[PDB]
Ligand binder design. Structure first.
Ligand SMILES: CCn1c(=O)c(=O)[nH]c2cc(C(=O)N(C)Cc3cnn(-c4ccccc4)c3)ccc21
Length: 113
């Protein structure tokens, strides 16, 4: 089955592709709790692309499903916290759409390995 190194290269490229869909850069660093003091009274597990990069390099993603789970958390946390009539909520909807396409293609390339 798969060698670890090519899979990690693929997750690195995929994470880069997902982060470039975040043109507002509202998903690339942890939500700043000092500015949003009630954030964790609603969000059980915050996630963002910088944390995902840390997890990737700590070897915490060894299959696609776990990588995709943390991406889905970025989206679902934002949909949960923010009202529907906000830029944030709509940006999460857009990321879900555009990121889903990136992830389907990355899964296809992994299925070659
Ligand atoms: C509505 C809750 N919220 C979400 O729900 C969401 O999905 N993304 C959010 C993204 C930000 C955001 O501006 N960041 C992550 C950039 C940043 C990182 N540090 N500082 C900072 C630090 C010190 C002072 C000023 C700013 C800003 C904010 C809220 C967010």
């Amino acid at each position: 089955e798969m060698q670890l190194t090519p899979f990690l290269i693929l997750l690195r490229k995929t994470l880069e592709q997902l982060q470039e869909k975040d043109t507002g850069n509202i998903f690339s660093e942890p939500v700043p709790l000092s500015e949003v003091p009630d954030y964790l009274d609603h969000i059980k597990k915050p996630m963002d692309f910088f944390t995902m990069k840390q997890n990737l390099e700590a070897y915490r993603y060894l299959n696609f499903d776990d990588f995709e789970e943390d991406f889905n958390l970025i989206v679902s946390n934002c949909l949960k916290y923010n009202a529907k009539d906000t830029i944030f909520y709509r940006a999460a909807v857009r990321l879900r759409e555009q990121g889903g396409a990136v992830l389907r293609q990355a899964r296809r390339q992994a299925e070659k390995m």
